[PDB]
UniProtKB/TrEMBL annotation, chains A, C, D, G, H, I, L, M, N:
<dbReference type="GO" id="GO:0004106">
    <property type="term" value="F:chorismate mutase activity"/>
</dbReference>
<feature type="binding site">
    <location>
        <position position="107"/>
    </location>
    <ligand>
        <name>prephenate</name>
    </ligand>
</feature>
<dbReference type="GO" id="GO:0046417">
    <property type="term" value="P:chorismate metabolic process"/>
</dbReference>
<dbReference type="GO" id="GO:0009073">
    <property type="term" value="P:aromatic amino acid family biosynthetic process"/>
</dbReference>
<keyword id="KW-0413">Isomerase</keyword>
<dbReference type="InterPro" id="IPR035959">
    <property type="entry name" value="RutC-like_sf"/>
</dbReference>
<keyword id="KW-0057">Aromatic amino acid biosynthesis</keyword>
<dbReference type="GO" id="GO:0005737">
    <property type="term" value="C:cytoplasm"/>
</dbReference>
<feature type="binding site">
    <location>
        <position position="6"/>
    </location>
    <ligand>
        <name>prephenate</name>
    </ligand>
</feature>
<dbReference type="Pfam" id="PF07736">
    <property type="entry name" value="CM_1"/>
</dbReference>
<comment type="function">
    <text>Catalyzes the Claisen rearrangement of chorismate to prephenate. Probably involved in the aromatic amino acid biosynthesis.</text>
</comment>
<protein>
    <recommendedName>
        <fullName>Chorismate mutase AroH</fullName>
        <ecNumber>5.4.99.5</ecNumber>
    </recommendedName>
</protein>
<dbReference type="GO" id="GO:0008652">
    <property type="term" value="P:amino acid biosynthetic process"/>
</dbReference>
<feature type="binding site">
    <location>
        <position position="89"/>
    </location>
    <ligand>
        <name>prephenate</name>
    </ligand>
</feature>
<dbReference type="InterPro" id="IPR008243">
    <property type="entry name" value="Chorismate_mutase_AroH"/>
</dbReference>
<keyword id="KW-0028">Amino-acid biosynthesis</keyword>
<comment type="pathway">
    <text>Metabolic intermediate biosynthesis; prephenate biosynthesis; prephenate from chorismate: step 1/1.</text>
</comment>
Length: 117, 109, 117, 117, 103, 103, 117, 117, 117, 103, 103, 117, 117, 117, 103, 103, 103
């Protein structure tokens, strides 16, 4: 059985450095939040960037932190007019017994606006 | 005696405010605003990233203490980056220009 | 082990009310179809909207039906020229032993055209 | 527990025949690579096509090879300027005990450029 | 004691890799990534141009030798630009923060 | 002995002209062009703003005097900013490179 | 009675820093030019930016120099093809007895081309 | 001598009814705020609408409240990327002796974000 | 105290000659209508051209009639769909004691449609 | 018995939440969402405008008291508009359907 | 005696067909087409959503029975929503116009 | 008699600094490659930039290296879809007796892809 | 001394095969026309394709006929409204003593319309 | 040996008459300037027009002055934003012994801005 | 007595300036501005081209001398083209209007 | 005897109607339509601008009186501009063609 | 003695060839090219339209006969429009320039 971990972080500009540095922060905080020791606990990781972020692949930042054998996938997020701009969303598929109520999901920077509940 | 002070600011408004005050107040001769910085640093034992701007302040050892205070007053950060780099040698004329335009003066009772 | 449940529903216009109401119908029919008791059976739920649907996030409708602790993710579906317009597709990752042949996949409204088999 | 299998293949043109024939090649090579006997070993399969590929749905090719009961989902991949053009990426969610180090990921045609490690 | 080190990197991945690693490994308290550099230099007795990025590393002398090795390990160039500029004076509290976050 | 010279130029043409010349003429081993600088300064007792570019020149103290003259000749400003920052320490073989390519 | 003061300054690029720094220069030179001691002498200040300047609001720079209680207003200037690019124009409505001939209007940078008389 | 009165109000959609109803609200609140008894106290009134508001002329709403003999003027506001969307700004040129410190400027709806000082 | 004078004139085409000639007509008729003898009676003059008028600056026409010391400002008018095309609107800020009821506002050519009352 | 209840909601999320709940909870047989309303009303002795949506709830008299409570529970407003309009006459079969899907 | 009849139709073609017919056949004096309704309702013990349009028919109690039949004939639904709301009071002249154009 | 010298260089971005610095590199490599001592050996030099390079004129870089008396000409290169992006191509018309086989043509950066033979 | 040889050929469609085959025809006919035995007689060869030809580089065909050591250059031709569509123009710079009157210039297919004199 | 002659002229509008007249002016001033007696002294003549000039072919003007046996070629010039608009550039490849320093290059109209040295 | 004066001007501003002044100054009754002229003429023994605009000035022989002076004052050219064409015959009423508006 | 008549018309429809009629009614041999005129003139002692078109009518003195009447009939203006300019000399053959086609 | 000759050409190639030639060959001092003429005329007893360009030739009566011949040689039309309009009066200096540049 698998438990998904959700994550969202916002960048101030569409620069590769910005995108890479922010996805590293989110990815690690997500793992830290759930006390995931090994990357082997990850079935795969899916990413979604907003339409206003095209300068870099977030998957390249996961490899910077050494997630080589972790399967990665990124896609374009729905361009809802008036939605929070420049948002990198993460869905990590984690192999765990952990209850739904016990998974910790990370919303960083202005992305806190996304889940205040 | 003449030195290049580095100041990292969070925004263009902060950059322009701090930049103008320093020159306008005779605390520095020139300020260069280098935009689009991506800053990686330690914040509460966790490595975090932020978007900033770099100020290259053309000043002198004399102006530095007041500059330090003034920048602190105008900067939104609790601990702002105010670091002076020494000018080893330079364009004689330029350094003069720097001396003409940098200096907050004294009172001899 | 995980079993994916597929769903598709079509909307007549790109209005938030339309998108929200339709995704609620699909989501519930998918759960009804496989008799899903709690949402704890859901590892995560992925959505894809066609290019002609941008007024609302389907994940927000999931929350209207209390899918708060379920990880949700939406992305832009491939704009194949002449494909079925205004389609909200769902891929629910369900934690189950159920055989592949025993999972019931829901295709509602004009989305019935998508799987007539 | 689930292990994601990654695949990438490049097509020379945006033609349905091209897209369909290439996704069939990738899909089967991915299964052959991991010695997957039945499609029942697959939780679901996610696909991403680059912005320069819109003539066909890769999910339709999976159906040509008889993956009808297999849940499929496709999305638009991030248009990173200067990235490898015309790439069909696959993320197969495989129900297995297999270690992370023991999964074989398939990068075909110019997509070999994508993972030389 | 405190220095500002300059590192010129060929790409944003190199910039982010090096930057994160130095801060994470407590080899630097802060790294500034300055993008869009156009570098003109001598390569095998011929003047050549390349697109780069500048790293402004906030560290100390004591940290420098390990930083040097680490940067070398992470940098794709055989002979990378790692040059330390002395901090003449500064914000007392900032320099304290820098020293604290370099361990 | 090895220094990082800062030169502020009004345009990319000035930048590329000065940058290429210094490197070509063995007055410097490397030049970094940092674009889009917004410079606030005092010009005739009034605070004025200008758009500029920053040059980060990798040279030696020995080259500096000739560099100073050459920059003056190529620079459109009457009083150009030519200010050298000392290199406290650095990646040694790179510093050799700088010294080898500054004749 | 009111007397309008006109100002024009050109920027080399569309950057907030550039726009802010240039408007500050113009605003102050306009006040210096007419020996305006207090901002209370200003009824209101109107600004116009050319179509090629959208990175910042000139009114935000007036606030940097402490014109909070001064009413400010900015609008899009007419895009005459071949007109001087990147121009920030100011119309300060000044409460004064000063004759029309005695008001000094400031045209800075390439904006000198705008009023050579 | 003239004193400018500033106002700002946001609308949720670009509909004539919305624009008209919101400008009426702002205009009256501005006059109420400064205790302006007659419209004859107004030299003229300038308006600026954001690029995302084109369905109606705010000057037409001033006429609904009977400002016929009041000179009105509307212009397009600077499209600063990421600025507050759908904002109707007003600059009323008021013939008064009132000090700068004594004029009350009205910021309604999400336009409160515009002047929190 | 100041009184605003309103004008409006329509041009048949977007030609500099047309724009220049029409504004002079309008400008002079506004002064003639209110019996303004000197240009010194003008605090400043604001202009607004419709989106379909970009060939010339109306301010350049005021200078042809000798309004050099008069502060001029032009801006783009709101492109309300179906509004009167090719309209040059003028707001002259006139330093006068004249009552609101006693100012004469000029609406020329098809711009008569704008104020039939 | 059957009435048409009018409810004004601030958003589409509120509309769809309230609408779905009443129908799902068998408190309504049908709810119609009328979008794009511009509402002018008195709020603290001042006339104000807000953007809203209208709900047309097909329910019975018998159903109204519980509906009232439920709508209150789901509505973000302190005093929500819940007003019942009587159905004078109608399609015999439709009114039967309405009564059937209520309770 | 005078009523406002509510009819929910599935499309604009249905709306215009039904609307024109009623007015033309002197069964109603006026019909208002309110578009873009998102309707949530119970269909075979399951809550379903569908896109419809609202018709506001200005008619009399006397016309209603024939109107009911006619609407049924023109409506694609098996059980169409035809519900009459009573007019408590109104513009004397308008109600006269309504009665005049319904016969 | 004349012999043409071919060159190609790629830039990473469309910045004036990048274009200028790269054309200087190519221009000299080309000369140094053939042992060109004086610029007087050049009849003229023609340049072609790809569609994605518009920030600077390559002829201006030739002047930076002192080719004032050398006739220069630049033109738009054919936008073949799938061709190497951001390429500055040079055709130097060199007054020489040198055989065709003895001229050395320079292909720098990713432009090496252009002549691997 | 150099003599330019002019050639023009039209293609029916924008296909690489068409462009390549047609440029080969023109190139050879030009050489045949002037009895040029060796490609060593060519200083360089410049090409221009019309805006409606983007599928291939004409230089790549010169290479098919073995002009590897021949310097080649192509650029976009002026899109004069109503000019002859799909035209490949060639300017071969030929090292010869031949008089201007003795050079034979080749105009093939509908490109005969280009020089009927 | 060949020496290239450069020329540049600006036109006020994109009209065939304008383009024609201007190119005739420049070509002749180029020849007179270098005292070229015979058009047989010309190897070939290349022209480049800016993107804002498409109404006529400059080669047609060369023929008006009798350059029929002269090989001509025109191409689109690099559209550098903000560069001098509406410019006709000429590169005449002239068969001469003349030193580089002794060739006279002609810049007419606002094209004087192009070479003030 | 009544003539059509041709004046070639360098710009739109020059045209509107000259044309309005003449009419306003009762020097002409009507001026027609013909745009987009491409003028070819001899300049310092060299055939040159310039974009110009044509003015068709309806005036009288009596106004001509003052018109000549006025045009000279307003025209940027040292030797402006001011050439009068005689009106052989015409619309009686029009020529009356022309004479009336030339005082 | 042969003249060039100038007629200013408010529109292209007026221009083409008048032009064609004259050529068709053998009142002229040729008419040239010059578009894009911006005419500044005196209308009721006030300087006003219009944006008209010019007709260049190739006719004879003998045709002129009928032409005058006809133009008046087709022209919307009360007092239209109909002014004849004399042809001093010309292409012998052209003038013959003009006289031939004016009957 | 000084005249304004009107020439209608079919194109700009012709308009420029003719214009330049006349001025260059000292047959005129100045030629104005008025483009975009829509020309309605009689061609073999049928009214036809063409797109032409008007030439306004500033020449002398003395030039006229060669001008006539030269225009004929360069003009594609069998019977070209070459019609001279007399200059009644003018700018003394301009007419001098015209006479000077017509030899």
């Amino acid at each position: 059985m698998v438990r998904g971990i959700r994550g969202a972080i916002t960048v101030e500009e569409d620069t590769p450095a910005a995108i890479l540095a922010a996805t590293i922060e989110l990815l690690l905080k997500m793992l830290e939040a759930n006390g995931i020791q090994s990357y082997e606990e990850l079935a795969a990781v899916i990413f979604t960037v907003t339409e206003d972020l095209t300068s870099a692949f977030p998957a390249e930042a996961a490899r910077l932190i050494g997630m080589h054998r972790v399967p990665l996938l990124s896609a374009r997020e729905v361009p809802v007019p008036g939605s929070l701009p420049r948002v990198i969303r993460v869905l990590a598929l984690w192999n765990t017994d952990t209850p739904q109520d016990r998974v910790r999901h990370v919303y960083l920077n202005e992305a806190v606006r996304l889940r205040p509940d | 005696m003449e030195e290049v002070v580095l100041i990292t600011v969070p925004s263009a408004l902060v950059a322009v405010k701090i930049a103008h005050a320093l020159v306008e107040e005779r605390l520095a001769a020139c300020v260069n605003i280098v935009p689009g910085l991506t800053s990686i640093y330690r914040e509460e034992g966790s490595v975090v990233s932020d978007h900033e701007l770099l100020l290259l302040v053309k000043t002198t050892t004399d102006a530095f203490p007041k500059l330090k205070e003034r920048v602190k007053e105008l900067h939104p950060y609790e601990v702002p980056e105010i670091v002076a780099l020494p000018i080893a040698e330079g364009n004689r004329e330029y350094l003069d220009w720097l001396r003409e335009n940098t200096g907050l003066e004294h009172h001899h009772h």
